[PDB]
Design a protein around this ligand. Structure first.
Ligand SMILES: [Mg+2]
Ligand SMILES: [Mg+2]
Ligand SMILES: [Mg+2]
Ligand SMILES: [Mg+2]
Ligand SMILES: [Mg+2]
Ligand SMILES: [Mg+2]
Ligand SMILES: [Mg+2]
Ligand SMILES: [Mg+2]
Ligand SMILES: [Mg+2]
Ligand SMILES: [Mg+2]
Ligand SMILES: [Mg+2]
Ligand SMILES: [Mg+2]
Ligand SMILES: [Mg+2]
Ligand SMILES: [Mg+2]
Ligand SMILES: [Mg+2]
Ligand SMILES: [Zn+2]
Lengths: 37, 174, 139, 141, 142, 94, 130
RNA sequence: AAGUCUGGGCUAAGUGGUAAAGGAUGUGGCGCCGCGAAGACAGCCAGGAGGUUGGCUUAGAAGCAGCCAUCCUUUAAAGAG
């Protein structure tokens, strides 16, 4: 998991969702999994 | 577009009973209780159930499709029922029933047994295939996931417990 | 005794000896290796040299069978006005130059390859290989 | 990075930062621009970092117009020094930017290139900014 | 070293090897010199292929940085392909906290002690012959 | 050719009140005429972005009159970068 | 709205040059099997008219705005319309209907056909060249 | 001490009840624009092919390391990606 203030798509297969207030990225590449923090 | 405003076809046999805060969905294979937001409207008529929203602002559109899908999921449940199927891989991993209680030997020093909750039911045809199958769609999904979690698939070898259909996606070693 | 692999590849009419990929793909094989040399570098030598692949079929009792064609439109343009590269920086670079019918001959050979039996759609064809090496079409 | 070639005076008073920008509020030379939304002393090092970022983005093609110039000298006392003994030494130059000002303009460049080069360049400045596209309203000015 | 191990590992063991001498041959090889604190350490002169030597030099320079005896002056560590340095690392610079009793407040009193130290490090840098310990050679040459 | 636009006479109304209601204060004038006027901003912005100051805009007055005009001046709100005021110059036969 | 009425006129022009323009469902083939029916219906007729392949929405406006019977055989499904009277076909439907009924499962089936000016039929167009 | 007063609205964070660049389909309200009976958008279902590995570079670079060019029939369509 990548925990950051600015979470964003990294590749086009990345998808941006909202989860428990923080902005999330999920993707089929686990390196791109981010939650805001 | 728009799920919620699609009317729910209710077959003869199953039936939907609107109570405070939920709808009772009863059918051939059992009974299910569907919590419904109080500020939604569930209309039960001649062989059709329909959900209608008070406003078409965004919290209401979100509760709209949710309700209609949750009720349709219960119509299908008490009607066909739901199942998921689990694949076991790995040069020694096996399943067997004693219960109906799943018993997994998946590489630990002990074998782990899973006791199924109400409904649900376990079927072990082949020793490398398990089936969860109840009328509650969300708790077939739940117990199916519970079982996989015992031994998720390996990043490196076709080993562990798999959803049927789940692609094996390995990454290289040395 | 190797299986019946369908042999789509990419080889050259001339550059022909068992250095890779002559070996890896034609591993699943057993054919006369120096035949894509022999028959192909000779019978289609009138045009010149250069790259054309080859479509073989292996059968289990070591059987070969292959047909081919024409050096690449970027060769038939290297004899043209003396090139052996492009022009590195085209789009403005007009090194060699050709006429609308000195680039009508070059499709006399690659004609049976596209779908255009019209040497107008087969002229601007080989004349499109012009720009990606920079040689012009005068007035 | 930019500084005036010569100055009548080396040190000058801070001034206020009031009002919308006085001029330079319309795209005047290029196709797109970056305009300031808040006032600030934008330092030369900042301007240089914004310029280079867009340059790097135009490695082949493009014109960059820098329409703000750091003519205001910036003063700072030496560290660990008590108050008094005169005004600090010039340690740099700033440009006074008020909201509405067009600070950079790009031309000769696709829309995507232009709004990406200006977006990075904004990230280099201490102020919120807005990317704008030459209008009939600029032409009328 | 290295090859046989990697032959075995990328091939899950099934790759074999054999060889025989087959002579000599020209190579595009460079002499890489290693100087510590400006003096060429012959003991560490090696020779590599220009495709790799930087990555070789980028390595020894830094391992030597981690094992050289930190001096009273900052010690440069360098690698040169004949008269041109290509990889640089620096050892500290052990120093005295000359400002330790400085709760006066006056910056001039910190400057006075700081100037003197800066001047002294210059002097100890210029005439400072560092020797590499035999414990460092073994550390770089494993 | 030329573009249409509905314009309306204003008097004592606060320019800011007008402006608060999506209407752009203006003045129409030539050597024979001076009238305080106001057009719709979104309407106006539609026409201006193509007419600009080069093409005749014709103003559609609520008394029926239909005047050919050239935009002689647009004053921009520096902070918001939106139009604050418009000069419409009325054309003739010279 | 917009730049494919440049294709309504195209399927009105090359349809105002016929009377026996049939329709098939040219889809399920690759690109090798594509140039197959492409050059073998340009070699069972004149000009270069295999199919035109245009929108069943606009092919229904052409067969509707030029009277042409409105070839309501089957406009749904993939529809390429074998312009058989923009070539010279007759029993050249057999050149198609057999070459399609050979390579791959049900290669290039048909659905509508106008015989000179009157509507042909479904299987009574595969037998209309047998 | 005095309305759990009335009418309409926002907010779901205990925000209110302690802050910024930046992140962002939070959510309400005004406007505009592109594309949608050549049926759009999302899902699925065809296809997605030829000159040609484009030229160079390079061990190899074939749309897809870096390079500059980015041009044609087949075409419903299909970038020197
Ligand atoms: Mg980022
Ligand atoms: Mg996903
Ligand atoms: Mg500052
Ligand atoms: Mg100052
Ligand atoms: Mg002071
Ligand atoms: Mg000062
Ligand atoms: Mg900023
Ligand atoms: Mg103290
Ligand atoms: Mg506006
Ligand atoms: Mg009280
Ligand atoms: Mg009350
Ligand atoms: Mg109310
Ligand atoms: Mg609180
Ligand atoms: Mg709080
Ligand atoms: Mg927001
Ligand atoms: Zn991703």
């Amino acid at each position: 998991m990548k925990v950051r203030a600015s979470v964003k798509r990294i590749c086009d297969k990345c998808k941006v969702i909202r989860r428990h207030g923080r902005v999330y990225v999920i993707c089929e590449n686990p390196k791109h999994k981010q939650r805001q923090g | 577009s728009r799920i919620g405003r699609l009317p729910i076809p209710v077959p003869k046999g199953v039936s939907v009973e609107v109570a405070p805060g939920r709808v009772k969905v009863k059918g051939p294979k059992g009974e299910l209780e569907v919590p419904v937001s109080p500020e939604m409207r569930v209309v039960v008529e001649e062989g059709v159930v329909r959900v209608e929203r008070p406003s078409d602002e965004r919290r209401h559109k979100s509760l709209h499709g949710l309700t209609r899908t949750l009720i349709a999921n219960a119509v299908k449940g008490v009607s066909e029922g739901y199942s998921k199927e689990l694949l076991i891989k790995g040069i020694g991993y096996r399943a067997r029933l004693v219960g109906r209680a799943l018993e997994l030997t998946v590489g630990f020093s002990h074998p782990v047994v899973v006791e199924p909750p109400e409904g649900i039911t376990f079927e072990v045809p082949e020793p490398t295939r398990v089936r969860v199958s109840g009328i509650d769609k969300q708790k077939v999904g739940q117990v199916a996931a519970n079982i996989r979690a015992i031994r998720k698939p390996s990043a490196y070898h076709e080993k562990g417990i798999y959803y049927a259909g789940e692609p094996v996606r390995l990454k290289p070693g040395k | 005794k190797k299986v019946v692999a369908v042999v789509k590849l990419q080889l050259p009419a001339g550059k022909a000896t068992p250095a890779p990929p002559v070996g890896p793909a034609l591993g699943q094989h057993g054919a006369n290796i120096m035949e894509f040399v022999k028959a192909f570098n000779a019978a289609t030598a009138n045009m010149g040299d250069a790259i054309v692949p080859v479509e073989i079929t292996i059968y289990a009792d070591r059987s070969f069978t292959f047909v081919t064609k024409t050096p690449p439109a970027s060769y038939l343009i290297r004899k043209a006005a003396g090139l052996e590269k492009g022009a590195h920086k085209p789009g403005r670079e007009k090194v060699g130059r050709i006429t609308w019918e000195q680039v009508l001959e070059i499709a006399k050979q690659k004609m049976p390859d596209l779908n255009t039996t019209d040497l107008e759609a087969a002229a601007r064809m080989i004349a499109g290989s012009a720009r990606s090496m920079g040689v012009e079409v005068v007035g | 990075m930019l500084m005036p070639r010569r100055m009548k005076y080396r040190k000058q008073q801070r001034g206020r930062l009031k009002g919308a920008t006085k001029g330079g509020d319309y795209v005047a030379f290029g196709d797109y621009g970056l305009v300031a939304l808040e006032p600030a002393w934008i330092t030369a090092q900042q301007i240089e970092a914004a310029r280079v970022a867009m340059v790097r983005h135009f490695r082949r093609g493009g014109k960059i117009f820098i329409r703000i110039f750091p003519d205001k000298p910036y003063t700072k006392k030496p560290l660990e020094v008590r108050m008094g003994k005169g005004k600090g030494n010039v340690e740099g130059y700033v440009a006074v930017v008020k909201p509405g000002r067009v600070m950079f303009e790009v031309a000769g460049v696709t829309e995507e290139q232009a709004m990406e080069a200006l977006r990075i360049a904004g990230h280099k400045l201490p102020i919120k900014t807005k990317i704008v596209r030459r209008d009939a309203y600029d032409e009328a000015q | 070293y290295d090859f046989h191990d990697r032959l075995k590992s990328v091939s899950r063991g099934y790759a074999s090897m054999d060889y025989e001498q087959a002579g000599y041959r020209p190579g595009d090889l460079v002499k890489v010199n290693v100087l510590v604190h400006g003096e060429v350490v012959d003991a560490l002169t090696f020779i590599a292929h220009r495709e790799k030597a930087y990555t070789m030099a980028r390595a020894i320079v830094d391992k030597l940085a981690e094992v050289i005896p930190r001096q009273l002056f900052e010690v440069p560590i360098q690698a040169a392909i004949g008269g041109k340095i290509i990889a640089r690392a620096t050892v500290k610079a052990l120093r005295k906290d000359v400002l330790a009793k400085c709760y006066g407040g006056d910056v001039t009193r910190k400057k006075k002690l700081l100037e003197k130290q800066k001047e002294g490090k210059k002097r100890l840098k210029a005439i400072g012959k560092v020797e590499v310990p035999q414990e460092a050679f073994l550390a770089v040459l494993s | 050719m030329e573009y249409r636009l509905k314009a309306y006479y204003r008097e004592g109304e606060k320019p800011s009140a007008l402006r608060r209601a999506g209407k752009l204060p203006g003045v129409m004038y030539n050597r024979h005429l001076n009238r305080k006027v106001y057009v719709d901003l979104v309407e106006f912005d539609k026409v201006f972005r193509q007419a600009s100051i080069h093409h005749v805009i014709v103003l559609e007055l609520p008394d029926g009159q239909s005047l050919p005009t050239l935009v002689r001046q647009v004053n921009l709100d520096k902070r918001r970068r939106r139009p604050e005021h418009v000069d419409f110059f009325v054309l003739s036969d010279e | 709205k917009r730049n494919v009425e440049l294709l309504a006129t195209l399927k009105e022009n090359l349809e105002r040059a016929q009377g026996s323009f049939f329709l098939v469902n040219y889809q399920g083939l690759p690109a090798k099997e594509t140039h197959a029916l492409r050059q073998a219906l340009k070699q069972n007729g004149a000009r270069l008219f295999v199919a035109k392949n245009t929108l069943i929405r606009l092919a229904l406006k052409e067969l509707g705005l030029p009277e042409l019977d409105g070839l309501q055989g089957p406009s749904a499904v993939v529809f390429y319309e074998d312009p058989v009277a923009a070539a010279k076909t007759l029993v050249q439907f057999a050149k198609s209907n057999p070459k399609g009924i050979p390579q791959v499962k049900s290669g290039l089936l048909q659905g509508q056909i106008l015989t000179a000016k009157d509507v042909e039929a479904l299987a009574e167009l595969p037998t209309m060249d047998e």
